[PDB]
Amino acid sequence: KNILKIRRRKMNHHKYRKLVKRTRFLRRKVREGRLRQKQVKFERDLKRIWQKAGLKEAPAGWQTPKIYLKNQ
Amino acid sequence: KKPNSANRKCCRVRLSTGREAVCFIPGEGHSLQEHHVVLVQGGRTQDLPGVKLTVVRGKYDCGHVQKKK
Amino acid sequence: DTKMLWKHKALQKYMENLSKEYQTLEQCLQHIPVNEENRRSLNRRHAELAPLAAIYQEIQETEQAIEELESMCKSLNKQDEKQLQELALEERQTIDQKINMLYNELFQSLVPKEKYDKNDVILEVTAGRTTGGDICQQFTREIFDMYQNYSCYKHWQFELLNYTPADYGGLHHAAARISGDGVYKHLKYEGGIHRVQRIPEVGLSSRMQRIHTGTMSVIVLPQPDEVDVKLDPKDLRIDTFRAKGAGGQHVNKTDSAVRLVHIPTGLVVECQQERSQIKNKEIAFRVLRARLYQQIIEKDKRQQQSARKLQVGTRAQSERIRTYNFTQDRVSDHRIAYEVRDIKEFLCGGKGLDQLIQRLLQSADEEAIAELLDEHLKSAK
RNA sequence: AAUGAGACA
RNA sequence: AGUAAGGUCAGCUAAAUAAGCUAUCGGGCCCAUACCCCGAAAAUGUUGGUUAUACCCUUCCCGUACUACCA
RNA sequence: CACGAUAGCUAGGACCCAAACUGGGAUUAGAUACCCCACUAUGCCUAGCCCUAAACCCAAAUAGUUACAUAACAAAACUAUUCGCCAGAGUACUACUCGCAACUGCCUAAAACUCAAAGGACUUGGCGGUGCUUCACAUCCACCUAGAGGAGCCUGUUCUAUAAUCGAUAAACCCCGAUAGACCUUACCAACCCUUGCCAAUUCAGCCUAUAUACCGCCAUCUUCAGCAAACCCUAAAAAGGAACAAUAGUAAGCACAAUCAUAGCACAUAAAAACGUUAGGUCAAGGUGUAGCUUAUGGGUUGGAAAGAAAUGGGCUACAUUUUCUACAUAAGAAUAUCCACCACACGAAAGUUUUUAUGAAACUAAAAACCAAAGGAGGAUUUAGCAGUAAAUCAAGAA
Ligand SMILES: [K+]
Ligand SMILES: [K+]
Ligand SMILES: [K+]
Ligand SMILES: [K+]
Ligand SMILES: [Mg+2]
Ligand SMILES: [Mg+2]
Ligand SMILES: [Mg+2]
Ligand SMILES: [Mg+2]
Ligand SMILES: [Mg+2]
Ligand SMILES: [Mg+2]
Ligand SMILES: [Mg+2]
Ligand SMILES: [Mg+2]
Ligand SMILES: [Mg+2]
Ligand SMILES: [Mg+2]
Ligand SMILES: [Mg+2]
Ligand SMILES: [Mg+2]
Ligand SMILES: [Mg+2]
Ligand SMILES: [Mg+2]
Ligand SMILES: [Mg+2]
Ligand SMILES: [Mg+2]
Ligand SMILES: [Mg+2]
Ligand SMILES: [Mg+2]
Ligand SMILES: [Mg+2]
Ligand SMILES: [Mg+2]
Ligand SMILES: [Mg+2]
Ligand SMILES: [Mg+2]
Ligand SMILES: [Mg+2]
Ligand SMILES: [Mg+2]
Ligand SMILES: [Mg+2]
Ligand SMILES: [Mg+2]
Ligand SMILES: [Mg+2]
Ligand SMILES: [Mg+2]
Ligand SMILES: [Mg+2]
Ligand SMILES: [Mg+2]
Ligand SMILES: [Mg+2]
Ligand SMILES: [Mg+2]
Ligand SMILES: [Mg+2]
Ligand SMILES: [Mg+2]
Ligand SMILES: [Mg+2]
Ligand SMILES: [Mg+2]
Ligand SMILES: [Mg+2]
Ligand SMILES: [Mg+2]
Ligand SMILES: [Mg+2]
Ligand SMILES: [Mg+2]
Ligand SMILES: [Mg+2]
Ligand SMILES: [Mg+2]
Ligand SMILES: [Mg+2]
Ligand SMILES: [Mg+2]
Ligand SMILES: [Mg+2]
Ligand SMILES: [Mg+2]
Ligand SMILES: [Mg+2]
Ligand SMILES: [Mg+2]
Ligand SMILES: [Mg+2]
Ligand SMILES: [Mg+2]
Ligand SMILES: [Mg+2]
Ligand SMILES: [Mg+2]
Ligand SMILES: [Mg+2]
């Protein structure tokens, strides 16, 4: 019967939900690490825009927000 | 792997592209030593997982199988 | 026999080299004013080859006398026929009597290099993992009792160390120490995998009487000798340097530290714990002895692990040194291609296993001697 | 009242 | 160094009325093993002294533990 | 764009009762589970978030047809317009990436590598601590009688032992091959002899040498179970199945059961029978034989010798008495009776052991009788065997070799 496939998917999900719990703080470090590079790479993309347009400095009053930051 | 059990004479060589791969020696008996030059084909051995190359007998430092004498 | 062994060209050629070398030793000493340091070395080498050179010369004289037998049989007269059959048929047998003494002594005096043979050996048997059931576990018990009875036949001493029975009347694993004079000599080629092919009779596998193949692994490890640390002032350099801490005037004006340096090894042990140098010196000596003793044990572990992880291998039927086929009543060793019948007596130790070991050792000597004779040519070329 | 099968098509 | 402090069945505990559980040995139950039921065996680290012994003290031995500070 | 059970988060309020987690009790080898008791998050109201389900009627929306036509199963088959989705299985409701009031999260979603399969439905068989109905006449429970396990002895295995057989070894081995070993038997061991070495012949005799996993023979067993096999027919296909008596696809023969026969009337009962198969069940050692091995030796003959029981166990005989013991004797008798004691001496129970003698035999080590001797045993732990009437039990006798 099809139960031979639901059980196989049950064990994999049950083992994955223990791999996250055992190494929860390892994922916390990596997630924040990827978020910093995500923000930094976004800054370089905006920095490329104004440099190629001929300007020397970013337009006055423009401070790039940290979109990938925890807020509410 | 079962149900086929034996001792297959293999070797590990580094190819001309720089990669290092596992190869197999067909036939019975060989005199291959370390730092010898051989030629490898693209055949595969069904019994051995992972092995996907075979040395072609009769080229460079490996000769043909020697008849019993 | 020994005559066939001598007829090999490698053995005759090597003895020629000894004959040439032994004569060459005399020529250099008698003629050349050799220096005293070099002269003694040749003198010692001259004495060593003195029995070997004489043995080969007697072989040549004996071989030449055989050539006389061929010539006599050629020139045959009716009256001389009786004389030759009464002399040549006796001289040839007499010649065959003498060559046995020369050839046997050559291998009894050469004595290929041997080591250990006087250290207690631990014999470990396990349960191979190749087939389900107790066919392999039950078979482990039989061979374990085979060696135990074999030790009594060889007048050895058997010391049980570990014994773990299995659920279905078997041996999961076991280990014992065997002490004697020739333990490691005889029990050197018994290490490997012993395959068994039989129809189950007693045990869990007896529920279905179909021929099954199982395996078990035997580990033979020579246990090392004792340890006794020997130290003397020649091996220790003591640097009475100062120490760092908080003692006011006392620390600034006291060398309350010891740096022990083991000259033979190079180890540096420094103790600066207490206030007095006497306390520091006492502890430093104790630590150096303890650390040196630990190094010896770790050396023993590496040697044993590098040996017990070789005989075990991957625990597969592909590797095996002996196959026990109860179905056809044969016990065959793959190395020597020697097959023995009557497994019932073979598994009870005694002469059944002793006879097999004798050919294993003779084959070992044959391989080493044959290679050495070629290696003599390699050194000569 | 927990466990067991190896070289049978 | 000094001081403290302990050794008991194979193992771990409580008592000195040397016991309890487990392990070990024998048997039963089951197709066989384990569980389970039944029966038996088993020790006071060491020497000396403690009416006489043991729980005590002493000697030997192993191992455990704290402290080694002001200049 | 808007919404989305339940669980979960943030803030405030409510709390009868239920209740993850946690604590106690019990069960179990262990029970951080099922069962019992207590109580928290929470289930509830207001405001915000999360956006996941077997979110399954596993069947998409709108118009229709009952024509064509049964893979299987299920909820019968199909046409028109349109959108979404699907390219072997495992890796994978995963890694990396984009968005998200999410931060142990959701959505999107690969590859390296491994295998030649994964998967849907069905058929027969086996099994089920699945349910319903019916039934065990030695039988599972309830229940009857006599015994085994406790002791001695006899005998058979395992282990121990020796230079000194082999085979059986869950039910279906264990007074088994043996209705039978002092030599012989005998196949075992230690020595010492013989090499056309039984016969008409043979570059051949001989082998208790290996293989019951090559076999014929002769059986064990499910089994006092009723089913097996061949011919033929049927099925909108057939792996297979084949009955309804007021009958709906089956038919007549073969083997087995049945009937009959034996135990000198019938009856009943007991014997005898019990197919096809299952366990590669037991037997190369009744004998024969395939294949493999030996051939001045694994063959043949002579002489002597296979002891011994630390210990464990199975099946038996004799007991542990008063329904008994002893004597006479067939069954209506006399006497004894573990206790008393001022001393004594005593019951039941040696089958064992010592000594003597007889029987067989060339040889007694084997058997039997007597005298002496009087030990364990005071109704036997867990557990377990047999029997439904001339049966259990008690007692007597003969025969096979
Ligand atoms: K069925
Ligand atoms: K009995
Ligand atoms: K005889
Ligand atoms: K035969
Ligand atoms: Mg998985
Ligand atoms: Mg190929
Ligand atoms: Mg293939
Ligand atoms: Mg070429
Ligand atoms: Mg060329
Ligand atoms: Mg298994
Ligand atoms: Mg287990
Ligand atoms: Mg919701
Ligand atoms: Mg909710
Ligand atoms: Mg809620
Ligand atoms: Mg949160
Ligand atoms: Mg709240
Ligand atoms: Mg509440
Ligand atoms: Mg409540
Ligand atoms: Mg609890
Ligand atoms: Mg719903
Ligand atoms: Mg769906
Ligand atoms: Mg839908
Ligand atoms: Mg739609
Ligand atoms: Mg609509
Ligand atoms: Mg519609
Ligand atoms: Mg159909
Ligand atoms: Mg397709
Ligand atoms: Mg794929
Ligand atoms: Mg999910
Ligand atoms: Mg995910
Ligand atoms: Mg009964
Ligand atoms: Mg009786
Ligand atoms: Mg008894
Ligand atoms: Mg007995
Ligand atoms: Mg026997
Ligand atoms: Mg047997
Ligand atoms: Mg014979
Ligand atoms: Mg058979
Ligand atoms: Mg009939
Ligand atoms: Mg009749
Ligand atoms: Mg009748
Ligand atoms: Mg009958
Ligand atoms: Mg009948
Ligand atoms: Mg068989
Ligand atoms: Mg059987
Ligand atoms: Mg048999
Ligand atoms: Mg025969
Ligand atoms: Mg036999
Ligand atoms: Mg034959
Ligand atoms: Mg003979
Ligand atoms: Mg008994
Ligand atoms: Mg009987
Ligand atoms: Mg009587
Ligand atoms: Mg009377
Ligand atoms: Mg009496
Ligand atoms: Mg009497
Ligand atoms: Mg008597």
Curated annotation (Swiss-Prot), chain C:
Q: Which UniProt keywords apply?
A: Methylation, Mitochondrion, Protein biosynthesis, Transit peptide
A single GO BP term for this record reads:
mitochondrial translational termination
Could you tell me one molecular function GO term of this UniProt entry?
Answer: translation release factor activity, codon specific
Which ranges belong to the motif GGQ?
A: 247-249
Q: Which residues form a coiled coil?
A: none
Fetch the Pfam families from UniProt: PCRF, RF-1
The entry's localization annotation reads: Mitochondrion
Looking up InterPro entries in the UniProt record yields: PCRF, Pep_chain_release_fac_I, Pep_chain_release_fac_I_sf, Prokaryotic/Mito_RF
Write down the Gene3D superfamilies for this protein, in alphabetical order: 3.30.160.20, 3.30.70.1660, 6.10.140.1950
The UniProt function text for this chain reads:
Mitochondrial peptide chain release factor that directs the termination of translation in response to the peptide chain non-canonical stop codons AGG and AGA. Non-canonical termination codons AGG and AGA are found at the end of MT-CO1/COX1 and MT-ND6/ND6 open reading frames, respectively.
Q: Which family does it belong to?
A: Belongs to the prokaryotic/mitochondrial release factor family.
Q: What is known of its domains?
A: The GGQ domain interacts with the peptidyltransferase center (PTC) of the large ribosomal subunit to trigger nascent chain hydrolysis.
Q: What is this protein called?
A: Peptide chain release factor 1, mitochondrial
